[PDB]
Amino acid sequence: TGDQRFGDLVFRQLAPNVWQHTSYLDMPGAVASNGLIVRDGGRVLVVDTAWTDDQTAQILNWIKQEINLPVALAVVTHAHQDKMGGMDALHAAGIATYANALSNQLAPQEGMVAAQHSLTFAANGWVEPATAPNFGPLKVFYPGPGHTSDNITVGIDGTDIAFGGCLIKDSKAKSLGNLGDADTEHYAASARAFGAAFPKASMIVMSHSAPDSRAAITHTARMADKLR
């Protein structure tokens, strides 16, 4: 209970300044996609678009009318439709968009529109600060290939929250979902690297489940072990 709707796109509050935006697409069943909205000082930061441009425009309208702070940047966590399907709506609103350089390189073949800006990463997985200017509380981390080769993750400074995207499944999941683009061999390690990158996080947000505990990370690596 307690999950606010606006148009067709649930917002749920996670922390006083972190909302979960949820949109739905129908996979002829229906499927939820989760993303984040972050209030940091006098601007708004977004993580992940919705499945489509119209849903993404709704997210923007909402920010305008529930937060009323202008959207500074948006970060998308890889080149899949649940994360990137709404790029045009972001660009029409003139919002600076960032993704892993690799996500941007793969976006055309994945049917997605590229972000305007490319994030690069060090060998230890942390984002190069100068490719991510003014991200504020957003801490961007590339844990290695897993769900896709380009998947990145984001921690929120000043919260128990880290966002795993489609990389992490929930603690009671019966599978790792879509392994279509998966790196089987490195998945377990990547799931574990995300865990270790945000060691103090206890609320883990993922793409198709309510926020879960760290058991989500542990369980996902367990399942991925059985792959390799």
Ligand X SMILES: C[C@@H](O)[C@@H](C(=O)O)[C@@H]1NC(C(=O)O)=C([C@H]2CCCO2)S1
Footprint of Cl ion on this chain (CB under 5 A)?
173-174, 198, 200-201
Cβ closest to ligand X, residue 80 vs residue 219: 80
Helix/strand/coil for 187: helix
Min dist CB 127 to Cl ion, Å, is 15
Closest to Cl ion by CB, 32 or 96: 32
198 contact choice in Cl ion, ligand X, none (CB below 5 to 8 Å, kind-dependent)? Cl ion
Question: Nearest CA to 203 among 159, 158, 156, 161?
Answer: 161
Smallest separation (angstroms) from ligand X to the CB of 82? 4
Q: Give which of Cl ion, ligand X, none residue 27 binds (C-beta under 5 to 8 Å, depending on kind).
A: ligand X
Of 78 and 192, nearer to ligand X (C-beta) is 78
- Least spacing, CB of residue 169 vs ligand X, in Å: 7
Binding site membership for substrate: which residues?
169, 178
DSSP state at residue 121: B
Token look-up 């921690």 returns 155
Closer of 5 and 174 to Cl ion (Cβ): 174
CB of residue 83 vs ligand X: minimum separation in angstroms?
A: 7
Nearer to ligand X among residue 149 and residue 207 (C-beta) = 207
Which partner in ligand X, Cl ion, none is near 21 (CB below 5 to 8 A by kind)?
A: none
Query: Dihedrals φ, ψ of 64, to 5°?
Result: -60, -35
Q: Are 34 and 3 in contact (CB under 8 A)?
A: no
Q: In what side-by-side order are the strands of the sheet with 203-206?
A: 138-141, 153-156, 161-165, 203-206, 209-212
Check: CB of residue 13 under 8 Å from CB of residue 45: no
Q: How far apart are CA 99 and CA 78, in angstroms?
A: 7
CB neighbour class for 64 (10 Å; exposed up to 12, middle 13-18, buried from 19): middle
Q: List, as residue ranges, the binding site for Zn(2+).
A: 78, 80, 82, 147, 166, 208
Locus of tokens 């930061």: 45
Partner in contact with 200, chosen from ligand X, Cl ion, none, beta carbon below 5 to 8 Å by kind: Cl ion
Distance of closest approach, residue 126 Cβ to Cl ion, in angstroms: 13
**Partner whose binding site includes residue 69, from ligand X, Cl ion, none (CB under 5 to 8 Å by kind):** none
> Residue 3 region, left (φ>0) first, then alpha (ψ -120 to 50), else beta?
beta
| Binding-site ranges for ligand X (CB under 6 A) | 27, 31, 80-82, 166, 177-178, 207-208
